[PDB]
Amino acid sequence: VYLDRKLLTLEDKELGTVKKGYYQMKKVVKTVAVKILKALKDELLAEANVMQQLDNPYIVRMIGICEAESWMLVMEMAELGPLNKYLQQNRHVKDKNIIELVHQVSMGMKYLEESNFVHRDLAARNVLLVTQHYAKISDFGLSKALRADENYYKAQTHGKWPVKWYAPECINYYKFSSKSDVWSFGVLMWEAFSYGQKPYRGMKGSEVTAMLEKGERMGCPAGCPREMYDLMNLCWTYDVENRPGFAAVELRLRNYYYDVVNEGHH
Numbered sequence: 001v002y003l004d005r006k007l008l009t010l011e012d013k014e015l016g017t018v019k020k021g022y023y024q025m026k027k028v029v030k031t032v033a034v035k036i037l038k039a040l041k042d043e044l045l046a047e048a049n050v051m052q053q054l055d056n057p058y059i060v061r062m063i064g065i066c067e068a069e070s071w072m073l074v075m076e077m078a079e080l081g082p083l084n085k086y087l088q089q090n091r092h093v094k095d096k097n098i099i100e101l102v103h104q105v106s107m108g109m110k111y112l113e114e115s116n117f118v119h120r121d122l123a124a125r126n127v128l129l130v131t132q133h134y135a136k137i138s139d140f141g142l143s144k145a146l147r148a149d150e151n152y153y154k155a156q157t158h159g160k161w162p163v164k165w166y167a168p169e170c171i172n173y174y175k176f177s178s179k180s181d182v183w184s185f186g187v188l189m190w191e192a193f194s195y196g197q198k199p200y201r202g203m204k205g206s207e208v209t210a211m212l213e214k215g216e217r218m219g220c221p222a223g224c225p226r227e228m229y230d231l232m233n234l235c236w237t238y239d240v241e242n243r244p245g246f247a248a249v250e251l252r253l254r255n256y257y258y259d260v261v262n263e264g265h266h
């Protein structure tokens, strides 16, 4: 897990801090994305501690950590960057391609759920593209390994939270589970089918909580298939017990994606 600073070459430019670099492996040279930490040390180490336990094709892999000028978390590079920014710049991306990418995110989330980790920041800015047809989930800084005896994480205080992606129980009871990640996944789907537009446009967090308590939900994005909007609405089931888990979500997306692939061949 501990990398050698001499084997890392960083580029001056800023991706997001997040910088591009190259790391000398056993033989090949690997292009990497590096989170630079310019309490804060413990936070980066806890993110690294989560990433080291994960191994899935739809999750960003951690190469390791390095303590040099600053603490650094070295990851595989997802060359095309965040999904929301990619879709904002590529409005030609087809609905079939969007379904493909959100289905890949659901496969990564089905694995995270099976692994009993809660992501707690699942949003389109935290889905990175390796290619136009390959998405990976990133940004595990708020993530938690669930206790062996519970299916949720209880936050102690309401911090600097991405409220627009949070389920009502996160806001009302501070409870985070794989089902609250499903609610966030519904918002991510809405962002993806909206080509990276921000959700709940022009609304404050308190207005969003009020809207959702009234049983109101964001409308269908232009050109979004009805089956995908119905799945977003299912993710936005108010009551946690009746909301689907990722196995049910991934299955729905998988079958729909096969239907669209079939329609494409016809």
Ligand SMILES: C[C@H](N)CNc1cnc(C(N)=O)c(-c2cc3ccccc3[nH]2)n1
Pocket: 015, 016, 018, 033, 060, 075, 076, 077, 078, 079, 080, 081, 082, 125, 126, 127, 128, 138, 139
């Ligand atoms: C906004 C993001 N949620 C910030 N965090 C991360 C994490 N990991 C990466 C990576 N592992 O490629 C990137 C990343 C950002 C980026 C931007 C342009 C091109 C490639 C890029 N890679 N950004």
